[PDB]
């Protein structure tokens, strides 16, 4: 019964740990979210600016 | 009316009135463990709904009191608490009238001196065993000294603290014993029913008070 009770408490802790993994990976991916468009688009844009200068 | 003995000789004249009562109450307590919860569950079940509430209550009254080292003493609280209050149920509630033991008189375990002095001595030397590991191995019982007023003391008090909780339960079981027997000795059973609920009051109250009492001794014992 001690095992069963600490299993209850650790099950609460484990669903909390799943919600915490969710909350951390949300921050990571949502940082990636605008950053992927920024990386691709600005890498095209500034390289375009420099190529356009040398071709002027 | 006679609390002394059962004539069960064991070489050294042991009391059987303690023996059979202790046996039956111990047996019912250990045998309620699998009324419906022989395969326990996270989702509470038949016996689970009984046992787990008691376990959580014991954790409540113990970890606050006992201290950081709560776990080595979780049996210590639950055994004494459950055993004593269920045995008080069996002592104030369970009848044995029309069949009487030819040697002695049996209604309760804690009736005789030996039962409760044994339990009290158990708790108090458990305090001392706690102080063995959890205090200076030189001085554990006679450690403290203020500006000297306590030179023979801190052990004279714990000489009688076992005696304290023993007599505490002594008089309280003899209390409900006498209150139950005297009104039936006066007049038939249907008249004392107004105060049989009073006799049941302290019978149900002894659970939490003895739990926190010996748990307070154990919380002293953490040191």
From Swiss-Prot, chain A:
The chain holds residues 112 to 167 of 222 of the full protein. It comes from Spinacia oleracea. It is found in: Plastid, Chloroplast thylakoid membrane. Belongs to the ATPase B chain family. In plastids the F-type ATPase is also known as CF(1)CF(0). F-type ATPases have 2 components, F(1) - the catalytic core - and F(0) - the membrane proton channel. F(1) has five subunits: alpha(3), beta(3), gamma(1), delta(1), epsilon(1). F(0) has four main subunits: a(1), b(1), b'(1) and c(10-14). The alpha and beta chains form an alternating ring which encloses part of the gamma chain. F(1) is attached to F(0) by a central stalk formed by the gamma and epsilon chains, while a peripheral stalk is formed by the delta, b and b' chains. F(1)F(0) ATP synthase produces ATP from ADP in the presence of a proton or sodium gradient. F-type ATPases consist of two structural domains, F(1) containing the extramembraneous catalytic core and F(0) containing the membrane proton channel, linked together by a central stalk and a peripheral stalk. During catalysis, ATP synthesis in the catalytic domain of F(1) is coupled via a rotary mechanism of the central stalk subunits to proton translocation. This is ATP synthase subunit b', chloroplastic. Signal peptide: none annotated.
UniProtKB/Swiss-Prot annotation, chain B:
Keywords: ATP synthesis, CF(0), Chloroplast, Hydrogen ion transport, Ion transport, Membrane, Plastid, Thylakoid, Transmembrane, Transmembrane helix, Transport. InterPro entries: ATP_syn_F0_a_bact/chloroplast, ATP_synth_F0_asu, ATP_synth_F0_asu_AS, F0_ATP_A_sf. One of its GO terms (molecular function) is proton-transporting ATP synthase activity, rotational mechanism. The chain crosses the membrane at residues 17-37, 74-94, 113-133, 178-198, 199-219. It is a multi-pass membrane protein. One of its GO terms (cellular component) is proton-transporting ATP synthase complex. Gene3D superfamilies: ATP synthase, F0 complex, subunit A. It is found in: Plastid, Chloroplast thylakoid membrane. SUPFAM superfamilies: F1F0 ATP synthase subunit A (SSF81336). Belongs to the ATPase A chain family. F-type ATPases have 2 components, CF(1) - the catalytic core - and CF(0) - the membrane proton channel. CF(1) has five subunits: alpha(3), beta(3), gamma(1), delta(1), epsilon(1). CF(0) has four main subunits: a, b, b' and c. PANTHER family: ATP SYNTHASE SUBUNIT A, CHLOROPLASTIC (PTHR42823:SF3). This is ATP synthase subunit a, chloroplastic. It comes from Spinacia oleracea. The gene is atpI.
């Amino acid at each position: 019964l001690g095992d069963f009770m600490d299993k209850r408490d650790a099950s609460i802790k484990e669903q909390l740990s799943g919600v915490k993994d969710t909350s951390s990976e949300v921050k990571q991916l949502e940082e990636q979210a605008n950053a992927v468009m920024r990386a691709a688009r600005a890498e095209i844009s500034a390289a375009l600016n420099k190529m356009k200068k040398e071709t002027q | 009316v006679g609390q002394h003995f059962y004539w069960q000789i064991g070489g050294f004249q042991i009391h059987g009135q303690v023996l059979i009562t202790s046996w039956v109450v111990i047996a019912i307590l250990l045998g309620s463990a699998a009324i419906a919860v022989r395969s326990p569950q996270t989702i509470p079940t038949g016996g689970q709904n009984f046992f787990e509430y008691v376990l959580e209550f014991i954790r409540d009254v113990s970890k606050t009191q006992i201290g950081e080292e709560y776990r080595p003493w979780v049996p210590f609280i639950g055994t004494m608490f459950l055993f004593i209050f269920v045995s008080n149920w069996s002592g104030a509630l369970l009848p044995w009238k029309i069949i009487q033991l030819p040697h002695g008189e049996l209604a309760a375990p804690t009736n005789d001196i030996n039962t409760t002095v044994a339990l009290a001595l158990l708790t108090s030397v458990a305090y001392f065993y706690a102080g063995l590991t959890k205090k200076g191995l030189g001085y554990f019982g006679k450690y403290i000294q203020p500006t000297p007023i306590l030179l023979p003391i801190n052990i004279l008090e714990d000489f009688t603290k076992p005696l304290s909780l023993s007599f505490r339960l002594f008089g309280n079981i003899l209390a409900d014993e006498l209150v139950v027997v005297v009104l039936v000795s006066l007049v038939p059973l249907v008249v004392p029913i107004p105060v049989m609920f009073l006799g049941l009051f302290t019978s149900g109250i002894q659970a939490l008070i003895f739990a926190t009492l010996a748990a307070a001794y154990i919380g002293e014992s953490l040191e």
